Design a protein around this nucleic acid. Sequence first.
DNA 1: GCGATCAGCGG
DNA 2: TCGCTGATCGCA
Length: 580
Amino acid sequence: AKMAFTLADRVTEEMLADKAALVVEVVEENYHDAPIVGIAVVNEHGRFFLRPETALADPQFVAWLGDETKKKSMFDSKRAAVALKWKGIELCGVSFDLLLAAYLLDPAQGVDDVAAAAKMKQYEAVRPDEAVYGKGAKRAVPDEPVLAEHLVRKAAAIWELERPFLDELRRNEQDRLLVELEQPLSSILAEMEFAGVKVDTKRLEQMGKELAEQLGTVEQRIYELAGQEFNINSPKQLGVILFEKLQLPVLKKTKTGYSTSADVLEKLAPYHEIVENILHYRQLGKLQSTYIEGLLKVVRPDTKKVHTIFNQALTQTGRLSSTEPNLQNIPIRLEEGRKIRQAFVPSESDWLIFAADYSQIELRVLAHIAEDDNLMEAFRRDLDIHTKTAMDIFQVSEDEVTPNMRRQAKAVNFGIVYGISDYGLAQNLNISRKEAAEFIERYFESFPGVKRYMENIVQEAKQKGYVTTLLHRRRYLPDITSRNFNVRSFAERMAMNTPIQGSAADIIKKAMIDLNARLKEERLQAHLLLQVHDELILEAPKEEMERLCRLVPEVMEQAVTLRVPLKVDYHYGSTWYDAK
DNA sequence: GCGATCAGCGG
DNA sequence: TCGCTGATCGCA
Ligand SMILES: OC[C@H]1O[C@@](CO)(O[C@H]2O[C@H](CO)[C@@H](O)[C@H](O)[C@H]2O)[C@@H](O)[C@@H]1O
Ligand SMILES: OC[C@H]1O[C@@](CO)(O[C@H]2O[C@H](CO)[C@@H](O)[C@H](O)[C@H]2O)[C@@H](O)[C@@H]1O
Ligand SMILES: [Mg+2]
C-alpha cells in the first residue's frame, strides 16, 4: 500500500516545476524560530522528499521557493512562511492553501490537519498528524522512513484535493473569498507575527513587584477576616469559608458546588468585609498571573519581543484569534490593568504606536443588512448610538436620558452585537428574564427593520441550512431545526449574529489588505503589528504620524461601501497605552 | 502528566 | 457570545 517517492539526497530540476504541492513541515505548535523537520514536493514529474539542511542550503531550491511564478499548493502556508522567515528565506507563489479552503467551506469541521481536510472529500490515504507525531509529552518526530512517507502522503493529498476544493468554493461563490481575501491576508499575518511587538520587560517586572506587595497585604487581610488561612484561588476552599464558615447566602450554584464568580460576590459585599477583599484579590491576581507573569514567559530574551500566532482558521464568525501570547484581551476597562499596555512599545527609537478602531462597525453593518430606516438615519447623523437607543426604547428626549438609561441601552446593543440570549441580558443587567425580553420587544418596536431581518434570517438559515456574510463567508446551522428549545434558540441567535460579526470580520480583513498595499505605494515604513477584531495597531517613525492620521482611517473607512458610513477613530503615542 | 472545572479578560 | 490563559484538583 506504501506510496512511491524519491528520497532525494540532492535537489534536481524536475523538483522545481512551475506547479507543485509543497510541504515544509514544522512540528512544534508554535512555529516561531522553530525547526523544519522535512520537505516534500509533489508535481507532474513525481513525488520527492528532501532533508531540510539539504534543500534549504540549495541556491536553486531557495530561488524556486521565492519565485512568485512557481505556484505552490500547501496546507497552512503561514506556518511554513514564518518558519522560513526566521531562516531568512522568502516563500512566494502560494496559490492554494488547503487549510484556508477547508475553513471557508465549513469552519465548524475544525479542520486542523491535511487528513481532516481530506476526509471531507472521502480521501483517506493520509494519516492524521497526531497519529504520526503523538501528543503531549510523548510527541516526537519519527524516524526518516516514517516521516518521509507522511510528508509525501500529505503533499499527495494536497495535490489531489486542490481541484475538488476549488470547485466547491466556486459553487459556494467563495472562490474570490479564498484567493483575494484569506490567502493574501495570510501573508500579511505572517509579516505581523514575524515582526512581533517590542515589550518593555523592566516596566512589566516593576509592576509585578508592586502587585506582589499589594497581593500580600490583601491576602493577609483575607486570612484575618476569615479567621484562618486557605487557598483563595480555590473556588472549593473559598466556597467553604464563604458559604459555610461565614454563612453568606448562596445566590448561585455551579454544577460542582458554590459559585464564587465576581457577579455573585458583588451581591454579597454588604454581608461581610471579606468579600470586597476577595474581589480585590481576584483583580490583582488576574493581572499578576495572566498579564504580568504570563506575558514575561513568552517574551523573546534576545529581542524583547512577543510573536503571537494569529489562528486564521478557527472561529465560526471569520474573526481571527491570537495565542502565545493572546494579544486580543489585554486589560483596558480598569485603569490598574490598563497600565499593562504601557509595556507594549515601538520596536525602534523615535517610532510610535498608532491605533485605529472602527466605531460601532457591528451596529453599522446591522443597519446596512437590515436596511432599518431608524438605525441607518442614526448613523448617517453619527449619533451616540447608545443614547439614541435609550431615547427610543424609553420614549424620552435626549436631555431626558439618564446615565442608567444609557447603560442599559448600551447593554441591549451589546447583546445584539454578540447575539446573547435574553437570559444573558438579564445576568448583565441584573434583572429578570421577563424584563430583559421586555426591553428586546421595545427595541424591535423602535427598530422594525432589525426585527424583520432577525425573523427573515432565521427563516433563511432554516431553508438553506446556513447563513452568509457580506463577502460570502458561510456558517452551517444544523441545530436550527432541533426540537430542543435551548439548542434551537442558540442556533437562531447565531443565524442572526453571524452575518453581523462575520461581515465586520470581512471588512477589517479587506481593510488590512488594502492598507498594506497603500503603505507600500506610499513608501511608508509604518507596518501592522496587531489586529484586535475591530482595531488595527501599527508602529511607525514619528515622522509618519501626520500622514497616517489621514491614510489609515480613509483606507479602513473605504474598505467597502455600505448604506451607512463607516467611521474610524485613531490615536498614537509612545506606548500602546498612550495610543489613547 | 492530563483533562475537567471554574474564573475573568477583551471585542 | 466566544476564544484565550491560568490555578486548582481528581485520575493516572
Ligand atoms: O499554524 C497555525 C494553524 O495550525 C493549527 C493546526 O492546523 O493550530 C496549531 O497551531 C496553533 C498556533 O500555535 C495552536 O493554537 C493550535 O493548538 C495547534 O493545533 C490551526 O488551527 C491553525 O490555523
Ligand atoms: O503561600 C503558599 C501557600 O498558601 C496557600 C494558602 O494556604 O495559597 C496562597 O498562595 C498561592 C500562591 O501564591 C495562591 O494561589 C493562593 O490563592 C493563596 O491563598 C497554599 O495553597 C500554598 O501552599
Ligand atoms: Mg471600537
